[PDB]
Amino acid sequence: GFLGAAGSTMGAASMTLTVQARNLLSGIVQQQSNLLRAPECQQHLLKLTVWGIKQLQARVLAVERYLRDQQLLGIWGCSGKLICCTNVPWNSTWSNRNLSEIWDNMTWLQWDKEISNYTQIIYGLLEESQNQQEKNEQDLLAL
Amino acid sequence: GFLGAAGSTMGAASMTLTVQARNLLSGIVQQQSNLLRAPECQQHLLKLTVWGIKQLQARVLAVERYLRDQQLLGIWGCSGKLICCTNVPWNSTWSNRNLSEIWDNMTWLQWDKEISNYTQIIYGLLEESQNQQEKNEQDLLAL
Amino acid sequence: LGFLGAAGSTMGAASMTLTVQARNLLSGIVQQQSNLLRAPECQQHLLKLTVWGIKQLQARVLAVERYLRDQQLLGIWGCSGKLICCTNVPWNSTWSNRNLSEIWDNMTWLQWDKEISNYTQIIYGLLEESQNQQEKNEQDLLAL
Amino acid sequence: LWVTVYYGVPVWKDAETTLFCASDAKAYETKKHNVWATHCCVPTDPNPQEIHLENVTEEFNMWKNNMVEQMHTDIISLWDQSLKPCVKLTPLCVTLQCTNVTNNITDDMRGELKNCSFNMTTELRDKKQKVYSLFYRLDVVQINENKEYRLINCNTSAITQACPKVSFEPIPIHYCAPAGFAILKCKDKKFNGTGPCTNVSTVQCTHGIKPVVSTQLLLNGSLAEEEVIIRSENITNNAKNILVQLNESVQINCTRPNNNTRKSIRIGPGQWFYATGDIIGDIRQAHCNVSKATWNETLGKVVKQLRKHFGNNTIIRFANSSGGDLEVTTHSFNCGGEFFYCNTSGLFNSTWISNDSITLPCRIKQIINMWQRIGQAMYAPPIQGVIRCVSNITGLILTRDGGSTNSTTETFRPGGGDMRDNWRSELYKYKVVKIEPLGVAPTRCKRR
Amino acid sequence: WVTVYYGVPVWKDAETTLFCASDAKAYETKKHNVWATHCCVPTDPNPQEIHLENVTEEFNMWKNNMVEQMHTDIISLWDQSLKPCVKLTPLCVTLQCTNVTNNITDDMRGELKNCSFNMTTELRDKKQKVYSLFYRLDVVQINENQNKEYRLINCNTSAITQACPKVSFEPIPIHYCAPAGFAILKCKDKKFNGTGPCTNVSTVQCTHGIKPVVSTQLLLNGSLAEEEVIIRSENITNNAKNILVQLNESVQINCTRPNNNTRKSIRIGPGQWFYATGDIIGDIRQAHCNVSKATWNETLGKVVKQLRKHFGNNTIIRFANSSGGDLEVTTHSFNCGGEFFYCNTSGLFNSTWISNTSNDSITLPCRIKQIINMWQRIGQAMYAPPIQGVIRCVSNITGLILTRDGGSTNSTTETFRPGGGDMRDNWRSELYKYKVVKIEPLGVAPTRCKRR
Amino acid sequence: NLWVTVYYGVPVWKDAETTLFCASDAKAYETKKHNVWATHCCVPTDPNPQEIHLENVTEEFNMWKNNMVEQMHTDIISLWDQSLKPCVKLTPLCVTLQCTNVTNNITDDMRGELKNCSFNMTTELRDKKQKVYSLFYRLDVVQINENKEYRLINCNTSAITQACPKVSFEPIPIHYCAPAGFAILKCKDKKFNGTGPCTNVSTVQCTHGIKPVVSTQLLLNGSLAEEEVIIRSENITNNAKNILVQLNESVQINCTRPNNNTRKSIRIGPGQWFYATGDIIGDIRQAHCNVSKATWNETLGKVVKQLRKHFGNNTIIRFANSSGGDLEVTTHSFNCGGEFFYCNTSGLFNSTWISNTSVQGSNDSITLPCRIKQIINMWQRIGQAMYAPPIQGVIRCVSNITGLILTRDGGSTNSTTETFRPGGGDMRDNWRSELYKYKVVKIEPLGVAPTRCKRRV
């Protein structure tokens, strides 16, 4: 059900995240690798360096985008968890959508369109928050 | 001591779990890369471009399988742990070897053949369990 | 600040700016690819140059491999997802006999790394053992 | 409220990436040294999966669809790679002495087929052999004027022979996106080529597209079952081509009633040159029979849709194309390994103020500059026997006459267009989008 | 109950791209040795084989994808090395030839031919008359109905490339290392009959080092089996399959081209040199091999005993020379000192064995061929340049390839002949011990523990 | 007790050697479409790159062990070969070349420097041969035994490829950039000689922008030294090491090919064109290189004054012209306007210094003659000769010097007139004059250190 809940409202799609989480890596890359290496006549494409380099670039950039997302989740704290809150309050500037409509009667696509320009501020705040949390952890464990 | 005690028993894995794990990337590609670049033969990899493409395919395949396993561990609430427990009950359908506790004599590569079926069912159960746990932890905060 | 947040300035305060060093290892790769992407009619000539394509592909793959090595090596030590983590392996005076104030000030990170280079592998080995023991103990605590 | 970071969000952004080919029915059916099957060795899904996106409305644009550019680059690269190891034909450029073919030839082809002969190298460098072969006049040019002749591409580019075993027959092609990307397929009935579309679904691979090369009439394409559709980036702008998609296939039967016999000459140490040895039977021009009544009905439907777009108080005319190269002034296509250039003046000759069959003459061209490049030239080997192809004309490429003509009569010509347009007729439904799994949202909960 | 274990020692039979390493990267040879230029990465200076206690594992040398990997690797490496070298397309011209009669023994009469021809040299307006000596296997007659006119055998619809003279083709040992995530299991069972289960399994990251030797009938410079003589032919009852015999003890063969030859350098292109065979100094004699006679008789007796162990005692075992066919398969072909030998081996497999007990040398004549069609790829030819001096090789015949004939109507005598011709078999002789295994270190298991 | 802490993101580094990424400025790609360097290093840089504070860090630099120079040499070699690869082969020119003198308004100097040659050339029809004529410089043509028959020199060693005329080899900034996980340490110490500690050490991601200029005896464009003059030899007293002088003040050079040249197009074969040198319009004169005499002798005085610090304070210093050898090294080779110049630098140097003033010397200008050859064997390769096409019209170039390459003649063990000559520097010297101050370093973000804190278990 890849992108099955894409037109569903926010929160309703939050139960499909694992299905969305997979197939960005392995599920499409590993399977396509096995299929590509399954039939004979591999040399009919290995010999053509242009196609091989194009496919390698596609695979490498897929892995790099996945690693970018994973490192961003790590540097904000709480990686390896698909849904995880933080301690950064939501500004009224960021679309001021204090309605319940944030979690109902609005698709994730429209919401991504809404706050597209506030993203980097949030990411910097998350980075600083994780820095503060780790410093506090080290200090308290020292105590 | 790679694959040491591979036929000893399931219960005597212990630090072998580390020994296998680091063998996937740590050293086996980085020290291998140092060995490859050391004698100043990069030109013979850039030349004979098919050989370079084959080496790159091997590297990205190793990285792809490692990231596949890491993502699967993350989806199951087991990221960063070589050993982790889950809440999914064990089914006698998967394995009825319960007249004697497994890990007493059984070794890997034998019990793995017994368990080769129903594996995707187990992976689906683990995925659903971790998703439910994440949803519960989302709800519990500020409840 | 910048790529190096007062690198070599001091051992203590330099640890207060670690996120940029952590981020660069893939931010550079992604931003280099972004720079290539914004410049169309560039990929064709470079792709036809098989040698250059293989060169930069190897560069990107090696960067990713080093980052994955570091992350796996932190995971084996029970420190995944933390830039700063403490362990339960006692420090040995054989590696270095200085006190905390002697090193966390009046010394730079590069000098410290030079001071404990020969023993580095040994420390790593010890760390591995620690994590395994802890995980085994956790199983016992889950048995109770 | 507080910040929550979500991974696995189902959202996307428009993006351009590299798609990879995949084909079905390749186990033994297409293992005849077919180019497309050989390159597209990746198997497809035996049971392709399609996911409907409920309540999703997305903006599509076929005239900015990077999949088309990807397909164009891929097919040109595949063509060049297929021709690359095949033998070269530089020694053919030697001076060519020709006479006319008068052996039981009809009046139509008088001068169309020339019996040429020439000195050429052998496996040994120091020994030359005089050989004889037939050439179509389109690939032969006179010089020093009396009977001396030259190949057309002698002074422009080296001529490569297509490998005789290699076949360029179209097969279904599925473009599959790599990981992190999805192909959104529109399902708006009578989608006019751009703008919003609902009923959208998602796929990992496109439906089977036959990469059929034609220059005036779209062949073996898909049918717009709902009604005849007209698409163009700007109807007012006469410089833009018009792609007309039909709701019924038109039947065309093209043929070369000549029982060809093919010679095989050794030119060098490991090099074979194939030349049209002779014609066993009578010589008659290659031609295409088009179902006349079906064509009349098809033009009627197209005229109705053109009236809806332009108006029903003006006359609509169809006239044959203007001047230029044979690649554009005629319906050029591939049939059974040979190449046809058919004069389409018998079709687009009509006016619509308010058992029969049409015969289109067709010439045969061997030395070809495919893709309208300059530095390359492909020599199609002759093909033994008699060639017949039965094709579905499914779409037309029309260009409105530039003149205003007092806004009285609008004349549409079969002007053809760029090769990309053909695949646009099969790639208007699709759009490539990269997934953006990471997002942020408000919540009522905060980290401890 | 479910525990997810990562780092589990689990195996899967899988195929992957191995890479190769040259032992020690010694610069004794240099000369752009193709086996040293390729396999750049240094080997392990001290490989650490790991024994797996209580591990019985299945092997199958006739389903081993390592063999195909090395066949593809050696073919591709040969093409890569040969590709940037002089093309002798200008050489394919009419040749005016005579017999060589100057100080030549009886056996070589008509073997050599002194051929003159016109060549294009350094300028497209100049034709240079040059001459060279060619072996009759590389030259064929044309216009036979009318000194005489000949051509090369490559002219008959094939392109020919000269090997770069500086490049050496000596078989340096090569260690095959598996990439990350894989391992190479070794059998070590000294009586392993090619397929099936085996004990004493061990693991390595690299093979023991294989010499990529090219030979057709007899296997040279291989490894020996300790439990007498090993026979591996799948199930041997099907006579259509080849039979690889690995020997208890090395049999010594001294092969040589005794003619004192000289290299004549000619220029064709701006920087393209062609290396013709100059006049032979001294007597012209037949290149030949000497096999230790009594050693050969003992070895063939051992092979006879091990064949009896499958076909019984009350049976006649007769060794006869190879059948007809191309020179590549009817003879024992090999590469000695950079030259190509084709030796008639009928002097060895000439015996009958019905035995009821249940100093001298054998001379093999050899022909020399310069124009090689390696691996039977029609459409490509490699020209081996002549090598000045006198060539001697001393080598260990360690195995052989045998084809069995049908049982006729009575099935009383089993007739064996030399076989081979598919180079993969040679590789199998050094790859029956190894198997490529993929590691899948992620498994599940039950436990008393449950997550909180 | 104290416990181990594992820090990630630790700012430490090692001296590693890796591949580097080249990237021109955006405007270099907007225009100069056919330029080879804009095409190759097409990926744009940061329009406003930022450097990093000094951080009170000292670091050791060594330019003669700098792998960046090897990287640039390999990159330019590969780029050059790949740029010449698609262009036409001129194998058909290796024919008996029948030549005579020119004798058309030729001054005394250029007598015999040009030759009117003719030959049978192929056409598109392989059986039809066309007699054609062209103009060749004497350096590209050699005699056969003995109006008179000659051959091209390349046909004696290797087949020759014509450079594509549309391709421009003009130098542009390159800005070598490090890949991810690496950084480039820049040394800002004024009068930094080389191979030593450096204190004013900044860190960057890309270099300041280096023109890949090709010149043998004198450098022609680049970065001027900060102050006075700097002398850079791996071992000054070795006598087999180049000296790599760099100047704080540029020296103007006016280079010119004055002949009004024209280009003649001949058809080699299908889609293949040979560009011969047509008849020169007007009169003929040898190529000139003008140097400001006042500036030149002042610069030489500065160089002598700086040299005296490394040698005895009263050592007489002697500048003599280059020794014999290959034309690549015995003269000042360079590329100007797509043509190749080889200038006799005996006019420069040729002096002695005893009291910080020219013994022979004392608005004016020194004229250096220059020969021109079309057939080039660049980088001292054996094969892979290149045929430079002629450039129509006249040729002008305004160049600087920005340092020169000198070799010290050992002579005897007693130092009377220790001599310096124009060093036949390899191209690695040409780029090592620019890539000094720069060191490539890998980042080792992982480290360990003791603390007071123990993990909680």
Ligand SMILES: *[C@@H]1O[C@H](CO)[C@@H](O[C@@H]2O[C@H](CO)[C@@H](O[C@@H]3O[C@H](CO[C@H]4O[C@H](CO)[C@@H](O)[C@H](O)[C@@H]4O)[C@@H](O)[C@H](O[C@H]4O[C@H](CO)[C@@H](O)[C@H](O)[C@@H]4O)[C@@H]3O)[C@H](O)[C@H]2NC(C)=O)[C@H](O)[C@H]1NC(C)=O
């Ligand atoms: C639009 O789509 C149509 C089909 O839907 C295409 O028309 C087909 O084109 C193919 C390719 O040329 C034709 O296939 C050819 O058929 C020849 C005749 O075969 C007869 O005999 C066989 C015996 O088994 C029958 O099965 C068959 O039905 C016929 O009765 C073959 O001789 C051809 O073989 C060629 O290839 C083989 C290798 O496979 C060689 O050994 C042969 O010597 C020969 O070179 C070939 O298979 C097919 O017949 C056409 N269909 C129809 C109905 O005629 C159009 O081409 C396509 N439009 C465009 C523009 O491409």
Ligand SMILES: *[C@@H]1O[C@H](CO)[C@@H](O[C@@H]2O[C@H](CO)[C@@H](O[C@@H]3O[C@H](CO[C@H]4O[C@H](CO)[C@@H](O)[C@H](O)[C@@H]4O)[C@@H](O)[C@H](O[C@H]4O[C@H](CO)[C@@H](O)[C@H](O)[C@@H]4O)[C@@H]3O)[C@H](O)[C@H]2NC(C)=O)[C@H](O)[C@H]1NC(C)=O
């Ligand atoms: C050290 O650095 C200096 C400058 O920093 C270099 O000197 C420059 O060299 C380049 C290349 O040789 C010169 O560029 C050429 O200039 C010619 C004259 O240009 C004048 O006239 C035109 C007439 O339209 C004016 O537009 C222009 O502004 C000037 O006033 C041009 O005719 C040349 O064009 C040819 O080459 C280009 C290549 O892209 C083609 O597109 C053209 O069609 C034509 O074929 C060329 O542009 C430049 O003029 C020099 N500088 C100065 C100030 O004159 C040195 O070369 C460099 N050192 C070394 C060793 O290279």
Ligand SMILES: *[C@@H]1O[C@H](CO)[C@@H](O[C@@H]2O[C@H](CO)[C@@H](O)[C@H](O)[C@H]2NC(C)=O)[C@H](O)[C@H]1NC(C)=O
């Ligand atoms: C090349 O020579 C020209 C003169 O032909 C120089 O041009 C001028 O020279 C006068 C001399 O007093 C200066 O005052 C001007 O400023 C110069 N003008 C320009 C535009 O250059 C020119 O400088 C010389 N170039 C070099 C590099 O030596």
Ligand SMILES: *[C@@H]1O[C@H](CO)[C@@H](O[C@@H]2O[C@H](CO)[C@@H](O)[C@H](O)[C@H]2NC(C)=O)[C@H](O)[C@H]1NC(C)=O
């Ligand atoms: C000239 O050569 C002499 C040696 O022949 C150099 O060294 C002198 O060695 C004698 C040996 O006893 C000493 O007494 C002198 O004092 C040395 N001379 C000096 C100047 O130290 C001498 O150095 C050489 N001079 C030069 C300028 O190279």
Ligand SMILES: *[C@@H]1O[C@H](CO)[C@@H](O)[C@H](O)[C@H]1NC(C)=O
């Ligand atoms: C192999 O099995 C035997 C008997 O079961 C046992 O004693 C021995 O320890 C095993 N080997 C190991 C665990 O390495």
Ligand SMILES: *[C@@H]1O[C@H](CO)[C@@H](O)[C@H](O)[C@H]1NC(C)=O
């Ligand atoms: C090896 O011996 C076993 C013994 O059971 C037999 O089953 C198998 O077929 C034999 N294989 C070969 C290749 O001889």
Ligand SMILES: *[C@@H]1O[C@H](CO)[C@@H](O)[C@H](O)[C@H]1NC(C)=O
């Ligand atoms: C050019 O003139 C000189 C006069 O000394 C003469 O020796 C030489 O042969 C001439 N060159 C040609 C090619 O005629």
Ligand SMILES: *[C@@H]1O[C@H](CO)[C@@H](O)[C@H](O)[C@H]1NC(C)=O
């Ligand atoms: C120079 O050329 C002119 C023609 O342009 C001619 O009249 C004159 O004699 C020539 N002079 C010399 C010295 O070549």
Ligand SMILES: *[C@@H]1O[C@H](CO)[C@@H](O)[C@H](O)[C@H]1NC(C)=O
């Ligand atoms: C250089 O030459 C000029 C010429 O007038 C002179 O003024 C100046 O003093 C000279 N410099 C030296 C250092 O000799």
